[PDB]
Each structure stands twice: as structure tokens, then as C-alpha cells.
């Protein structure tokens, strides 16, 4: 109530001075009135206690913020401490929200709460501060400071954008989807370690375009559109190429059905769905193994390879097992199972000869490591009432003589019962993520090298190291996580011409290109 009272006091004072006194009469009067009232109340009335600035902002009082902004705008150094206290409250709320101590937090809920806080502060800004530049700059700096505290922030946002892109069940229409995507990219604008935001988003691209189809269709093009902008076309071309090559995949798969009606030598091609991707966009999962193939899939792969070598010469294909799925038609009804190009080999070995074992699926299969264990437990361990794979020596640990059996378990009347236990989420593990992020850092450092050297030899060379400032400015958001890789790189590179910088003679360099 003090602010309304001092506003009424200022109003009655200026009215008395303009009506009862002379014509100008106001400059020193209002100056001294401000210097006495506001310059004294500014320090203590907004921070002490009992509904000051922090409390009146926490409960969400719009009129209070508006009147405080319209009052403190007349006195200098008012907006300064105003934004200072606002940023202090923002830091407190962030440290209360970005708290890492404690496991069991939902990443999507965390990103949703962060976005809600951002939208609330933006609404308060637009409603009270009249879109002031200082408040925007301070909140931008605060979001830049408090967000890069955790390294899982880009990973948490990638999971959120994947949950929002996999299906538009919430917000069927396009307007709210557009708004939430704009808010998401705005939140990403003040984020760091965006190199793995892109690597984890490419991991999600692979998860949403290899384990399923028709994810969002037009909304994936909405994604490429909102991506082209953001930080500029430098990491967006990557996504462009990925989507162009998935289009290549679908077109080449139709081409395959078409001319398999041409390379048909067997009948293992009842229903085939082959996808053609490029290794320049999709990384190798673990090792690209070379396990065996069931006979009808053998004939299908042979037909596909013959077609791809006859009508698509100039490139050879490689076989793998760590990707895809299948529909195993079992048979009282005919319930069709599902094997992620994973349970196909084990179930085929069970067909060829039942009573198999670990010393049977690990010896005569050329099967990979613990990924095999996760693919195998999908049918036996942690199974509800759909356990189609049972065993005689039932034990948590896997010995070597555990014989296997198949249980009818007539419960799923649907003829499309699937066993999904693997790849529950997409959090991965600390080591592999770290090493691949270091690989992205080394790639960005090679980028630095190329850029700086080429530009300088045509566009202003340096004396010792002065344009290095420009090349790091070009890759600003993509510079942090790499340590001294850049230094070791430019060092190993000093060898031929078109680059000097030699610590012994770092003077004026050549001016070619």
C-alpha cells in the first residue's frame, strides 16, 4: 500500500504546484521529491520482508509489478536494482528447479515446468514491464547462467521434443503445436552443449524412423522448417540431409518391391520391408555384427542384394542384425508374434531344433555381447502373462545348460502380440555418450582449423593469434565442452605451406587463399 500512497502524494504535489504556484515550478520540486522518497525506499522496500518485490512476484501480482515499474522508471538506478532482485529470484527458483541431488525425476515434467516458468515470466514482462529491454537482457543472462549448470539439460529437452513429435495426441490442432514448438526452440536458444542436443536428437530421429513409421508426417517437415532458422543453417543442413535420405529409403523400398518382381528366384519374399539408409547420417550401433539369417529371410536378402547389385550398381550392401523388427506368425489360434530382427534368430533356431540352450545360442549363432542378453530376456525375463518363451532350469542368472520351452499362454487374443522390453527409454549410459560427445568436439575442432586457416590466408591473416578470436566467435555456441583439442590440432597441422603461426616465427603470414 505504500506505492499507491506515494503515487497519490506525487499526484497531489504536482497538482498543487501546477495550480497554486507558478508556471514551471516543477523541475527541482519533483527532483527533490524523488530523491527523498524513491532513492531512500528503493533499497529496503523491495528486499527486506513482508511482500516486497520477491513475494509480490512469487504469488503473481500483475498490478503490483505494473505500478512498481511505472513508479521506479522516473528515478535513475531504479530499474538496475529492480532487475538485480528479479535475477536473484530467478537464480533461486532455478537452483530450486535444476537441483540434481535426487534420482527419480521425470525429464519431460522438468522441461515442462521450466517452460511454464519461462512463459509465466514472459507474461509478467509483457503485462507489467511494457517490454523493457533491460528486463529482457537480464532474464536472458539469467537463463544462460542457470541452465548450463547441468549437462543433461540438452538430453532432457531432446527427450521432451521426441515425446512431443512422436504423436500429437495432446493438442490435435496445429496452432498450439506451433506455439509449443516455438517456446521449445526459444528455450533451446539459451542452452549450451547443443552439439549433443543434436546428437541425441539424431539418436531420436533414428529411434522414431527405424522402430516405427508415420510418426507425425507433416509435423516432421514442420520440425525441419523450425530447424532451418534457430542458430542459422549449419547444423540444420544435417537434419535436412537425414530427412532427404529417409525419403531416399522409402523410394528405394518401393523400387525394390517393383524389381524383386524381377530378381525373384525364391519365395522367401512373401512380405518384405527393406530400408536403405546412408552411413553418413546414421552411426553404427555397436559393431554391425555378422550373425546368421533364417532361410526365408536368407532368400529375401539374397533377392534384395541381387536387385541392388543389378539395377543399382556402384555400391555394395552390408548385413547386420542390430536394427529392425519382424512379425513371427505362430500357431487354438494363429497368434502372430514379433521379433525385433532380434528374436528372429533364436526362434528360428528353436524351429530348426527345440531343446536349445545358451551353449546353443551363443555357439552356433555368432551372436554379439550383452545386447544379446537384453534381446533374449525380452521373451523370458520380466514378462507378464504373455511369456511365449519359458525354460526348465528357471534362474535369474544365465548358466549354460538352461533348456528352453515355448508356453502357449492363451491370453492375448489379438493376432499381433509383441514382446517389447528392450530399449525402454533413450537415456543410454555415461561412458559411450561422453566419448561420442568428445568425438563431436574433435570434429568441431577440425572445423575451427579449416575455417581459420582458409579465411585468414585470403581474409586478413594474424600476427601471433588474433583472428582465432573470430573463428571462436563463428563457433560460439559450439565451443564450450572441448578442452585444448584445438591447440593440439593447430600444432600437429603446422607442417606444409598455407599456414605459419610457428611459435619461433609467428609474424605476417602469406596472403594467398
Amino acid at each position: 500500500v505504500y506505492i499507491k500512497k506515494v503515487e497519490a502524494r506525487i499526484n497531489e504535489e504536482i497538482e498543487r504546484v501546477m495550480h497554486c504556484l507558478d508556471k514551471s515550478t516543477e523541475e527541482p520540486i519533483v527532483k527533490v521529491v524523488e530523491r527523498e522518497l524513491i532513492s531512500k525506499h528503493m533499497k529496503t522496500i523491495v528486499e527486506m520482508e513482508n511482500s516486497g518485490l520477491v513475494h509480490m512476484l512469487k504469488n503473481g501480482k500483475t498490478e503490483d509489478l505494473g505500478c512498481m515499474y511505472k513508479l521506479f522508471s522516473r528515478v535513475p538506478n531504479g530499474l538496475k536494482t529492480m532487475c538485480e532482485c528479479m535475477s536473484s529470484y530467478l537464480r533461486e527458483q532455478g537452483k530450486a528447479l535444476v537441483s540434481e541431488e535426487g534420482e527419480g525425476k521425470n525429464p519431460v515434467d522438468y522441461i515442462q515446468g521450466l517452460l511454464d516458468l519461462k512463459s509465466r515470466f514472459d507474461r509478467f514482462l509483457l503485462e507489467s514491464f511494457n517490454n523493457d529491454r533491460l528486463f529482457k537482457q537480464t532474464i536472458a543472462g539469467d537463463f544462460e547462467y542457470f541452465l548450463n549448470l547441468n549437462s543433461r539439460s540438452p538430453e532432457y529437452l531432446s527427450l521432451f521434443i521426441d515425446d512431443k513429435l512422436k504423436k500429437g495426441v495432446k493438442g490435435l490442432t496445429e496452432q498450439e503445436v506451433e506455439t509449443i514448438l516455438d517456446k521449445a526452440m526459444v528455450l533451446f536458444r539459451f542452452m549450451q552443449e547443443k552439439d549433443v542436443f543434436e546428437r541425441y536428437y539424431k539418436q531420436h530421429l533414428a529411434r522414431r524412423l527405424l522402430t516405427n513409421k508415420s510418426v507425425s508426417d507433416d509435423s516432421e517437415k514442420n520440425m525441419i522448417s523450425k530447424l532451418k532458422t534457430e542458430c542459422g543453417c549449419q547444423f540444420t543442413s544435417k537434419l535436412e540431409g537425414m530427412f532427404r535420405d529417409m525419403s531416399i529409403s522409402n523410394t528405394t523400398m518401393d523400387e525394390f518391391r517393383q524389381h524383386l518382381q524381377a530378381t525373384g528366384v525364391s519365395l522367401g519374399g512373401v512380405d518384405l520391408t527393406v530400408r536403405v539408409l546412408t552411413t553418413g547420417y546414421w552411426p553404427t550401433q555397436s559393431a554391425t555384427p555378422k550373425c546368421n539369417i533364417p532361410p526365408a529371410p536368407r532368400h529375401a536378402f539374397e533377392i534384395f542384394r541381387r536387385f541392388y547389385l543389378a539395377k543399382h550398381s556402384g555400391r555394395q550392401l552390408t548385413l547386420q542384425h542390430h536394427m529392425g523388427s519382424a512379425d513371427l506368425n505362430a500357431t487354438t489360434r494363429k497368434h502372430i508374434l514379433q521379433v525385433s530382427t532380434f528374436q528372429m534368430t533364436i526362434l528360428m533356431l528353436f524351429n530348426n531344433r527345440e531343446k536349445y540352450t545358451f551353449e546353443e545360442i551363443q555357439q552356433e549363432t555368432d551372436i554379439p555381447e550383452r545386447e544379446l542378453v537384453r534381446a533374449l530376456q525380452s521373451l523370458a525375463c520380466g514378462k507378464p502373462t504373455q511369456r511365449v518363451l519359458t525354460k526348465e532350469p528357471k534362474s535369474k542368472e544365465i548358466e549354460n545348460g538352461h533348456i528352453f520351452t515355448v508356453n502357449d499362454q492363451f491370453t492375448s487374443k489379438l493376432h499381433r502380440v509383441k514382446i517389447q522390453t528392450v530399449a525402454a527409454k533413450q537415456g543410454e549410459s555415461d561412458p559411450e555418450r561422453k566419448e561420442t560427445r568428445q568425438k563431436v568436439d574433435d570434429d568441431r575442432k577440425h572445423e575451427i582449423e579449416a575455417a581459420i586457416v582458409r579465411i585468414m590466408k585470403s581474409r586478413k591473416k594474424m600476427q601471433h593469434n588474433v583472428l582465432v578470436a573470430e573463428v571462436t566467435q563463428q563457433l560460439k555456441a559450439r565451443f564450450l565442452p572441448s578442452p585444448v583439442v584445438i591447440k593440439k590440432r593447430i600444432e600437429g597441422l603446422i607442417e606444409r605451406e598455407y599456414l605459419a603461426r610457428t611459435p619461433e616465427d609467428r609474424k605476417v603470414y602469406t596472403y594467398v587463399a
Binding site: 556402384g314 555400391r315 506368425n329
Partner: protein, 89 residues
């Protein structure tokens, strides 16, 4: 039989080998050394002088594209800025 496969959905990866018979920068071969390894020096020993593979899927001697990346930097057989997607044949 008891279990019969109806559908399959393998994903097949690929890698094209551009006219593997010469190099468009120095005009010698896809391998078998380069101009900076036949005329420049003779030893040609301990020379990882290998083939470089771009994202545009063109191929040259590592050396010949490295010497071309000095002045120019945009792959002479199209316009693409050109990456580095492989080393060796």
C-alpha cells in the same frame, strides 16, 4: 512348421565407389600413389598416402584434396562444400 516368418523389415545400409579407376584432381589412379608421390618424391615409402571419401561420395587421393583445400574448398565435381566421410578405399 510351428513358427513361420511372414513380414521382415531389415534396413540395408550402402556405400558407392565412384569410378574407382582414377583421381579427378591429379589424374593418376584411385590409389597407386599420386603426383605428389611419383614426381615430388620417389621413395613413396611409409606413405599412408591413401584415398579420401567425401559426403558427396566422390573420391580422390587424400593428398590431392588436401592440396586442393589450400586455395579452394568446395569439391571440384559439383559445388557442395565437401566433408570427410572416410579414409582408404
Amino acid at each position: 512348421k510351428r513358427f513361420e516368418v511372414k513380414k521382415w523389415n531389415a534396413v540395408a545400409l550402402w556405400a558407392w565407389d565412384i569410378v574407382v579407376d582414377n583421381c579427378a584432381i591429379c589424374r593418376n589412379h584411385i590409389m597407386d600413389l599420386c603426383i605428389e608421390c611419383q614426381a615430388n618424391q620417389a621413395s613413396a615409402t611409409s606413405e599412408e598416402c591413401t584415398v579420401a571419401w567425401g559426403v558427396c561420395n566422390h573420391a580422390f587421393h587424400f593428398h590431392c584434396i588436401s592440396r586442393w583445400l589450400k586455395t579452394r574448398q568446395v569439391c571440384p565435381l559439383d559445388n557442395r562444400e565437401w566433408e570427410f566421410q572416410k579414409y582408404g578405399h
